[PDB]
Amino acid sequence: GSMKTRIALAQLNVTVGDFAGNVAKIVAAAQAAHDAGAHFLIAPELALSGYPPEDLLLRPAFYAASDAALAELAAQLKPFAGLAVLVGHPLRAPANRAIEGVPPVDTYNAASLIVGGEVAGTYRKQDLPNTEVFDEKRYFATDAAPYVFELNGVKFGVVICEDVWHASAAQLAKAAGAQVLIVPNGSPYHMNKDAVRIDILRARIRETGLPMVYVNLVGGQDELVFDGGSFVLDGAGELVAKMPQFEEGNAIVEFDGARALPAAIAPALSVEAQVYRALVLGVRDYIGKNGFPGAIIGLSGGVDSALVLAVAVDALGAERVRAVMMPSRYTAGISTTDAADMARRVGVRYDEIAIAPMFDAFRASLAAEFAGLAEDATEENIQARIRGTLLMALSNKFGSIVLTTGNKSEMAVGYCTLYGDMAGGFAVIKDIAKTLVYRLCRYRNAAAEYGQPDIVPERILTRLPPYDVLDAIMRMYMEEDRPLAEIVAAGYSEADVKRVTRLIKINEYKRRQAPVGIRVTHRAFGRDWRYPITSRFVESID
Amino acid sequence: KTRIALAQLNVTVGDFAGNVAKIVAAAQAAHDAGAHFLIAPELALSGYPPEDLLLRPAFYAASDAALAELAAQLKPFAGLAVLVGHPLRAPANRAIERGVPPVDTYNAASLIVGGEVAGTYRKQDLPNTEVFDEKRYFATDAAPYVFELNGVKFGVVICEDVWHASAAQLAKAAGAQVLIVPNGSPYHMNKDAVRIDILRARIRETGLPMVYVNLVGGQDELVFDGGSFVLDGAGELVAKMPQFEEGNAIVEFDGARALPAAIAPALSVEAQVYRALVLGVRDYIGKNGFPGAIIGLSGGVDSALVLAVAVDALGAERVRAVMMPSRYTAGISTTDAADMARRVGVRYDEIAIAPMFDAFRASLAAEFAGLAEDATEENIQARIRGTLLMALSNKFGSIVLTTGNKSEMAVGYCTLYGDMAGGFAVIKDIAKTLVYRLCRYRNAAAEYGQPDIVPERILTRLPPYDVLDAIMRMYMEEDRPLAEIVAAGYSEADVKRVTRLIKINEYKRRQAPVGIRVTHRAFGRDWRYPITSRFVESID
Description:
2 copies of one chain form a homodimer.
Chain A: E1 4-11, H1 19-35, E2 40-42, H2 60-77, E3 84-92, E4 107-115, E5 118-124, H3 136-139, E6 148-151, E7 154-158, H4 168-175, E8 180-185, H5 193-208, E9 212-216, E10 218-221, E11 224-227, E12 231-233, E13 239-242, E14 249-256, E15 259-260, H6 271-290, E16 295-298, H7 303-316, E17 321-325, H8 333-346, E18 349-352, H9 356-365, H10 367-370, H11 377-398, E19 401-404, H12 408-413, E20 426-427, H13 434-446, H14 458-461, H15 467-479, H16 484-489, H17 494-506, H18 508-511
Parallel strand pairs in A: 1-2, 2-3, 7-8, 8-9, 16-17, 16-19, 17-18, 19-20
Antiparallel strand pairs in A: 1-14, 3-4, 4-5, 6-7, 9-12, 10-11, 12-13, 14-15
Helix pairs in contact in A: 1-2, 6-7, 6-13, 7-8, 7-13, 9-11, 15-17
EC number (chain A): 6.3.5.1
InterPro entries (chain A): C-N_Hydrolase, C-N_Hydrolase_sf, Gln-dep_NAD_synthase, NAD/GMP_synthase, NAD_synthase, Rossmann-like_a/b/a_fold
Keywords (chain A): ATP-binding, Ligase, NAD, Nucleotide-binding
């Protein structure tokens, strides 16, 4: 009659550009699948490269690196006899020739099946998302060809992420003989996204009658948090397996012929629990993937910075977080008392630095122009900028990142100060409306699993080469996306090319907060240059 | 002969009223010159590029109302037809679903004749590389538009429609004898050569003359250079308008044959780049309603260049220079800074930073006990200067123009909130090598009585939160019209206050650190708005 297929769902937390580490994570997942006796392992969208790599996908050397990593991966999977692996990767058709300026022609968002240490086949994405947070029509060409393969007597069809948004890809896969659809995803979290996913896949299942296996990335990548939540629906649309959100790992699910069999279904999290876990994972990964030693948080004594402190301690542990209160002459005693209280509750280092001497000095320096004028936002903003300068000094001297505490409501109506309360590396609650800030504090105070309860005070809740050389290397690397080896071949030293290009990468975080400026070249540091901050891509010099 | 007016207009994103006034003024001039036809640039009516305004149903409603008003205002110009670009949504403020591809929104150009829209072209090939993202906003249409004026058939294609053979072929098969091309083509060095080459590839395939009308003016990072031109049916250049200037020019056709007209004199690459910087500064200040500019002067070449550009853009009376010496700033620097400001005739002030710096040092002395002073203390100094310039900006309203160059941006020789503190980074795309060339250019281009801007020595050296949040969610997250937010039970006062502050503070959000997305419409890549915008939505 029918055979069983034992499938490992690899809900991986890969890192943009970290080919070596990503290969190691996929191999580790494969080892675990082998240890469990699986026939088949499925990894997420663009697992090999991490996701989304943004304008790395315009750089020929990035695709060359991906191809080399895919070959390394296949070699390392070869020892797992009988285990096939479906892995996402960027693909350029048959290397370092320029990527033109004109639409994508021969680059694809792909998933390849590796069998016996060789690529057995490849699917290329059809429906490229180019709305919201994605710009895949900037990077990839479309392909309409289905990919169906046989494994344990069952025909499996592959489609990738937003291919499920319309009828077309699934119908082409079914017409090519698919009996089960396999879907690698890089689907970022938002509130109610878990419901959206199951609704869209049910629409496809109504049309095709085919069960669907949905495997998602997990982890933080700059503004995005991938929540995992991989799942399986049977051919009637019933949920038969569901992995936890916001956790990395592997789960085993089974099929008997084309029938999806029941497995573990993680209980649903409340919307508040999902949002809080997103914030924790985002902070944990922005610090971890970038290699920061810890975090600094300016505490006002108010609820916004209280939430950020709670999230940071949950993400990093108290030993890697410090809190700084910076009172002015106006600062109420209850504010410093409240700030010190919460720092004690979570066991973080707490320091106070008075800003009056700096503020007095600024005020003195401007006395001639401002005298007799009403105090307004100008004076408040100077105070905020003094605070930003202090936190950035501590960050610059000892290396921890400043986590900023401006909420979405404040961002919206401009109740914030450039270079002041906005000064820092990562805006933890930039997408949390003030109303939700309160709800999340109540949530966390009650959430036993995090350890210490009631950490946010209840009372706040009821209230170089020379320039000619440097510029030449910049033009070739930045403006023209040339491989480092081609820059060296044009007559520049390996030492100079390495030094300049490393510094260009290192300083992405800084450029991304720069004021807008005037474009006069064909590749400026504006909309022409859309790079990840979190990235471990290091291109070989030769 | 057919007389065609090329309206090389400087429109403003969102400024429907003012853009209409500019087009009507151009039409008046054309009518006085006996023109049969006037051609305006790509998305002239709305300004270009409006970015995520093109996801907002009210923006298309405003555009339709503006097009109706324009047609009515053009009606007295008997005998003159006007081709105008505009965003178009097919037949009101029903939601534009942002989670699926555009379906019924187009980049359009309509011909107005006798005070009525006679016909409409919709763009076919949408740019979605470099600085453009039109596949986020618009659907493709491969229908041609060809009309007859003074006995000659004219076909319309829009900007990047010329990158491939298709649109021109479809127009020619629909009867076109001359192709008319509205553009929103931004400047970059050598872009002028790219434009003529691509149009010549099309003319090889069609044999039809082409009329290329381009936008001019600054729009956030972009500077549109104008440089509108005509090629005859063999690809010969027969007319060319100046770069970086607005104007109207008449070109004539004898039947379908393009006749020679004025060809503007050329500009060196340095001269072009310099004028782009001037126009960009002039328009960022002007279109955003800033009263003037503030520049931190170090005595070095970069801030000298930015001072020169600012004075040329705005006039000396709208620029002030501030030198902020530390205890040990070299005397040569403050003399050179003061001298530069005198030469261009601008207000100059010195504000010593040692008292602030000493106060920061004392406040951090326990924390930094035993450690050498290093880049950390240099950065504190840079941040003090940024705070000073921003205080002047905050109190009196002028924008701070920052002086970091492209080389510095590249390798990180710059300080967040310090030398990067300000509103507009004039030379962010000028490599250090090019800074020197532009200073030499500006010295070379000096007027009589003005001497070197830069000396040789230097060159060779609110409702409650529950209500606020509900209004934010409807306006920002859901792109709802203001009138619908009012109809949901919120006061006109509250809705106006909250939504005007959202717009006003775009400049500020755009310098914020990256943060975590948890909603379907965060202030990251979900929200791509122009800073320069005069879009004001009606409350009813």
